[PDB]
Design a protein around this ligand. Sequence first.
Ligand SMILES: NC(=O)C1=CN([C@@H]2O[C@H](COP(=O)(O)OP(=O)(O)OC[C@H]3O[C@@H](n4cnc5c(N)ncnc54)[C@H](OP(=O)(O)O)[C@@H]3O)[C@@H](O)[C@H]2O)C=CC1
Ligand SMILES: *P(=O)(O)OCC(C)(C)[C@@H](O)C(=O)NCCC(=O)NCCSC(C)=O
Length: 1374
Amino acid sequence: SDNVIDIDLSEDSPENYLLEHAVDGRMLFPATGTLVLAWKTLAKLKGVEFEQLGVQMTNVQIHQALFLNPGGKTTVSVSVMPITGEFQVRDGESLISSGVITSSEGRLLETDQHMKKGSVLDGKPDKELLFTKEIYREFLLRGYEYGAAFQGIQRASLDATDTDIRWDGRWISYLDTVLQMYLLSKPGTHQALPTLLESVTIDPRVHPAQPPEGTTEFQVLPGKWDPVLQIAAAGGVEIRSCHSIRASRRLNHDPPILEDFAFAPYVDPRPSDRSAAAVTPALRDYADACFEFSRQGMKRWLENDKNNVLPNKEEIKEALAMANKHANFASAKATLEALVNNKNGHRLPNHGLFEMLDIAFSEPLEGDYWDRLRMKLHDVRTYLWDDPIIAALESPDIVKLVMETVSDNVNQQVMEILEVGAARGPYYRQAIPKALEYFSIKDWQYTVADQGFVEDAAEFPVKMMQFDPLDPANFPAELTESCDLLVLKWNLQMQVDLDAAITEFSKMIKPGGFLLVLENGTRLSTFFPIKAIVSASLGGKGGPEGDRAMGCFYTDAQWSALFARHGFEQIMHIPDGIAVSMFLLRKPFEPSVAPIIINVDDLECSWLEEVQARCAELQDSHKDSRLWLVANTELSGVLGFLRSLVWEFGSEKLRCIQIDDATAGPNPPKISADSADFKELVRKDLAYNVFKNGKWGTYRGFVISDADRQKERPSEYVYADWLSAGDMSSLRWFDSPLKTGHNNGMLGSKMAHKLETETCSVYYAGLNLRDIILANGTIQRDILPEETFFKEGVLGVEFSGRNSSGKRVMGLCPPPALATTVKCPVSSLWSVPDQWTLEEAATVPLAYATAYYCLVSEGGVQKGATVFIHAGASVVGQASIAVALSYNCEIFTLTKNSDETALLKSMYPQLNDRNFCSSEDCSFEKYIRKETKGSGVDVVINTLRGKFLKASRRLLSKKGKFVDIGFKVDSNTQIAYYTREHPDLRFQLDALLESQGPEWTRLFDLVQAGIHSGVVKPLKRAVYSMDKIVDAFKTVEAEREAGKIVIKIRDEERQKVCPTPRTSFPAIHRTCFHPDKSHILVGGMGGMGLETAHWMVLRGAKKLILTSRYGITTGYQARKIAFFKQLGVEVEVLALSVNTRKAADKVFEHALKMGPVGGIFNMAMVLYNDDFLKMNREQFLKPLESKITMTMLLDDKSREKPVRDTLDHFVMFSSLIVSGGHLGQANYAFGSTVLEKICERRKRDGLPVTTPQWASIADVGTVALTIICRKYPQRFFNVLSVFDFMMSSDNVVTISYVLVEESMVDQVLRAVGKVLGIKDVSSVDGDKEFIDMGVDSLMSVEIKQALERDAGLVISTKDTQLMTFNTLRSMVKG
Ligand SMILES: NC(=O)C1=CN([C@@H]2O[C@H](COP(=O)(O)OP(=O)(O)OC[C@H]3O[C@@H](n4cnc5c(N)ncnc54)[C@H](OP(=O)(O)O)[C@@H]3O)[C@@H](O)[C@H]2O)C=CC1
Ligand SMILES: *P(=O)(O)OCC(C)(C)[C@@H](O)C(=O)NCCC(=O)NCCSC(C)=O
């Protein structure tokens, strides 16, 4: 109605700086933005200039978020009431801000900060001051992405009190920099969006005028944060009592890929090896049964045949001989159908071969046989391609080992892949999505070819071609020396003359190129029936290796001999054992000049000069020349040294060999010049040869599936939490730190109350409406008592189980009581009478504890009084009635339907139909006001809101008490709580349980008395198993029926005093650190170390020893070290480099004096970057002190007592240079690999070990100061999410890196899908509602404003979470 403001976010608009203010990629309109809009509107209403007006806003609620549209225009409709001052910023029919704005001509500023002249932060050292770089590192880690216009604070103190805010003319930015003093006054790790500024004064007549136009050296106005009054003041601005709401963090990039750098043998892999085929017992049994099906079926073909219709009839008869050589129909299917319908968990992903064998066999013998079934089997060809037998040599592990080992050894910049015969056996469907979509250093070229057009290869990044694959001598001459890798999936068998086929195909391979073949080698009669129908002809020429089986196919042993006979070198060979078999072949390499061997065994780098000289001649040598780096010991970082060296010299003449002495078999290799084992290696000419576990292989990074990050394993102590906040379908069971004895959240306030606690084993956990409210996002955990801020979880309070002595007990404890073990204060634990089962006792404590608090403690009920109870059927409602009846009260209750009324009457016979009303409408007021004869009700237990709350107040007697225990309070009544206008009684039982003072003991005595006197009686119950936690929570939320919901954790024993049997529960990982153990963080005072030490402190660590070469040398370090000490952590900062056994002893001496050493982390780095040839000895060994010299001295200490018995974690941070390499960092690659091998010797001996192998990381360190080797930097809040996975894992090194990535109907769908965090909208189901995937409270508003910004649709927020993708598509068209 009033002034409409147009925010122009264009390329050169003056308000283009408003885009330099984002929260994890969300470009929101500043909360102080609405303050200026309201401020300017009032001035325009008054007619004065907005800079000459002194205003004061009160209770500025940011009702909803405004998402600024980049490169566009947003409109708001500020409206100010003339005399009252009620201002309102809105956009259409949606509210965006509210409050009251008032102008005045007198002093509006409370604090006397507009008078300060200079800056208190003068003359202070650099280690007692924060600067612009360090202040906004703190904000960035919390999700606040400030740009250059919003980076006002130039300096500050370690206390955050004094600042040097900059004044540059813009008011929306200045008021935000004053609101940043509030945010950096509350150190933490979560992301909070301000939503209520209780008072703001912007008196501009005491504020310096706008800078003279053209200024660049803007002045700085001293500011200060008043922790007493909660006032942030700077110049002529003050913001007082600003509150915020926690928000979940959004990942701007895509999820990381985690791999497992592990050794993988090349030839004849044993079952225990990683390159071995994936043959579980279930698959082998399926092949046996299915092979029997082929045997039994093929018998029927030669029995029913009477018209001579069987294609290639003679072949089937010949094949049956093989089946009998390597040995009813109804039983054959019976066995398979038993396997096809079982759900024991040992099932195969799908049974495709049988579906193809069944359709062919079951098909009838009659006319058009050959053509009819040749057109039907071809339609189910997907079954043969996607089958467990065939998917055993196409699994991700084997496919990657193939493509990467080829990529490493191809000495060009583009990997050319040519597959011939792609219509029958396609290898692009496996090669591309499993191995070639993870490439980041080599670009690939895939060419599919066959007789016709490849239909299924249409969606893949391939190029098509046409020639005859089944006939040689006709392959186009344009393909000579055209591909580095040749793929022949199920193609060589269809040739008639193999010798003519191989010799011609070998002309395809470039010099040093590779060839790949997949063929059936064992049990050759199993797949024939499909082949017989599909193959037009089955006539082929045998060879010296033997006559071709059937007309096509050749036994594995024959293939190997044939390829060997034709002068091929077997680089790899993976025999599946059930059917197919893979060969990866390459021609021999005969050097014309003797190879050069340089032993790189030494770790002191006595070989550096030799390598430097002999690698400087690589650019002027014969192509056949080579340089081999040989290491005959386990500890040698030559696999990262080469991979970084090959970046500066090419892969034509750089090779390495590493013999692992520890794992070398009884016959170790004898690689020495004119040796025997060496000559074999030279012929293969592979860039990476490692002898480990008695086989030649290569170190490869195998991708860890994303499903394993949430895999559940047995755990003794577990507790329920949520994976994503605000989603009730994401509740899982995580590991509980109570395995360490103590509990998380022992920081800050929780250390002031030294309550004596009894460790209890939870048998039943009660579910209240408090837990559902927190779980489904209706309330953030910050509303709870401050003592629960750092707790592991906030779900569950009541329980019933057995104490440490075996007695049966029940009570209330600070959360999480929804666990299997709790530490309940001894003053909150009642004893179960010897008439209630542990199931019944789980319903009493909270329901009756709140009933007594509402009536006897807060309402002061008296005998004969009249009480009004809302929601009589609820658990607290039922408890309230029982207490009141014991007090001989007159009861009026609100019952939803007649079932609830009947239920209550049955439970309490004293209730007639006169004591019941209806909650459907506020018609009870007349009834209660007539039956009480106008006196009203003495006590009102209120849960309903809105008009029912008003009517309930009006029923109060003159001395009546109103107890409001509802959870979904309004906005005005939420302000009342903040400003101390009303008391917040909806989380008082929680607050009492933290303190457990005189107020609580009154309730403990009352409930305890109630048990004895018979008032306290168990309520109705509904037990839910542990795994049905999600269903239990939904049942409580719906409130479709009355009764308690209790989760059964264990089974109550028959005895009454007996020990709890030790059992395990399935739960997700959660790393925890012992509070009584000291943790060493070597080099932990920098970048990732300080933000990792923060993570450990939140997860249990309370004893840290941070080590550095100098000490605390920056203001950011001194601030966080002071922050930890404030939280109750004992931090000792040592300025000692551990580069000598003496120093290592000193560091651990200061450790054992704090507590048993229960962790050693090395996050040290000293980088020197330069080309390998220009680096002297001293310059080379610079990054080799924190990664080699240290890690061996820290390793040695952990191997010797008393640390060995006590040590629990041993983490050695590494980088991707070990697996990807880099240029100039030959030294850092060498050291980083030796750190990766010292962490595998620990695994051989069984000691704990972990070695994260990171990639570019953001927000903290080296990169912090983007895209290197095409890999995007990770967000640290993800670095710590995967790091938690890394610690609770069995592997040594876990690679973690991030790789960089129409109609109007599809336009908005992609945008809407992007909000939810979906990369392919089409992939997910079109019938699955948004709430099912997950839509918290900010994704819905973004979609709501996007469906209007992008299209004309205007939807409701609630409608967003219950609408499918199909609904959205069908709605935009309308
Ligand atoms: N940052 C990234 O993006 C990546 C990180 N990593 C790994 O993660 C860690 C990153 O830490 P980051 O802080 O980023 O590196 P920084 O260079 O940012 O700081 C590293 C710390 O190492 C400490 N340090 C170096 N040498 C010694 C020594 N001899 N004795 C004690 N302390 C020492 C320094 O303390 P002072 O300066 O006081 O001596 C410095 O604070 C490293 O271990 C690195 O290998 C892996 C891949 C990439
Ligand atoms: P639901 O629980 O209804 O969610 C309420 C939300 C959407 C969080 C709403 O209250 C909101 O968006 N408030 C935030 C307003 C805001 O963005 N203020 C600060 C500006 S951005 C900044 C600090 O970077």
